[PDB]
Ligand binder design. Sequence first.
Ligand SMILES: [Cl-]
Ligand SMILES: [Mg+2]
Length: 211
Amino acid sequence: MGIDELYKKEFGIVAGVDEAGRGCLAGPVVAAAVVLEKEIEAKRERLLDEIMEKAAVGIGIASPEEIDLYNIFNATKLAMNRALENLSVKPSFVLVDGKGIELSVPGTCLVKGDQKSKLIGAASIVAKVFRDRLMSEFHRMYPQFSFHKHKGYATKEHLNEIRKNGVLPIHRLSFEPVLELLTDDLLREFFEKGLISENRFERILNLLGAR
Ligand SMILES: [Cl-]
Ligand SMILES: [Mg+2]
């Protein structure tokens, strides 16, 4: 909509920040931070290629473990800050998709920022394309799960897969739909095998015990 134009001149280097995967049942939250010089007008992958040519980009991830330990809001912020740390240029100001998120660099959050700002639009594209590739990797690791299709979102098929095959360490064990399927025995298996940390094990065992 052109909101970036307001921030072009008084705010030093400005980056746009967005995420992919906040709403998922499995996998990380992936954040992108983007500083664009040049003008930019699977249209996603078309745009990714132009972004790659015309922007400085940084990527930050927060794992299922971190989501389970810190909560989805803190984990998303952790990813976003990591994305800013990953940028080769240090921005002076950030435009962030959402509401009430305070990052390591001062900024402003825009509700539906991905429709209002080109910078944030560009960050949303990078984060989505890159997270989608990762989820396709996870279908290779866990072929009983169609992560390549649902991307770990709680679709009918994903839920059917969890019910039939069991929860995985890459599931967000603290989220009700997963937590309600998880057994004490499977959780102990994960810990026994070194598939989850002791901190994560204890956290989820508490959540399960209080049920
Ligand atoms: Cl873990
Ligand atoms: Mg967003």
